[PDB]
């Protein structure tokens, strides 16, 4: 039964993800014998992996959008901290105008 | 080249884990079936590197998808992505400490 399977989700990625116009798509039989030893394997590993361009940019440009908008988060905290800094940084500086003028 | 030498660098070309250990020799037969033989010229060159996406990637673009968090079309990708522009705004108020 599993050859049968294979050769249906092999023509549906060929036909639907990569593109290829159906008139060109061999029978589901003749798709059958690219499954026979080791070939099996080969073309599981090309179902999953293999995507159209347009599919893996999608893909990609969505998991580079929402990294981004992570560390505008991870940012924040950060901003606290810069502020918490920044603070330090201009009480040491009237600290320092006041001594000079004293000076 | 023989057939098989073209599938089994096409395999080799879209990182397929055991693509160093195969022989160009055992896959000539597949090229002999005249009715194959067209599918297996057409998959020779239409998949590249560009068309492969990595399992890790997979996994979080389906987590992603799990969060149920709105996946943005190709688009609306192009908007933002162009509009985030690699601002070096992090620079800016870095700046402002290191003036300080």
């Not at chain 1, 029978?27 to 995507?51: A, N, P, T, V």
Request: aromatic share 8%.
């Amino acid at each position: 039964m599993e050859r049968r399977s294979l050769a249906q989700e092999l023509k549906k990625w060929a036909v639907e993800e990569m593109g290829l116009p159906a008139q060109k798509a061999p029978s589901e039989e003749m798709l059958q014998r690219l499954f026979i030893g080791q070939c099996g394997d080969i073309w599981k590993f090309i179902i999953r992996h293999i995507h159209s361009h347009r599919t893996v940019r999608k893909i990609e440009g969505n998991l580079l959008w929402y990294q981004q908008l992570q560390h505008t988060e991870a940012q924040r905290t950060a901003e606290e901290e810069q502020q918490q800094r920044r603070k330090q940084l201009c009480k040491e500086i009237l600290e320092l105008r006041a001594e000079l003028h004293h000076l | 080249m023989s057939g098989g030498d073209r599938f089994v660098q096409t395999l080799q070309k879209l990182n397929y884990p055991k693509g160093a250990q195969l022989d160009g020799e055992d896959f000539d037969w597949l090229f002999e079936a005249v009715d194959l033989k067209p599918f297996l010229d057409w998959f020779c060159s239409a998949a590249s590197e560009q068309n492969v996406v990595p399992d890790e990637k997979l996994q979080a673009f389906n987590t992603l998808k799990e969060s149920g968090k709105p996946v943005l079309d190709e688009k609306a990708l192009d908007e933002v992505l162009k509009t985030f522009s690699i601002s070096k705004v992090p620079a800016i108020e870095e700046v402002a400490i290191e003036k300080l």
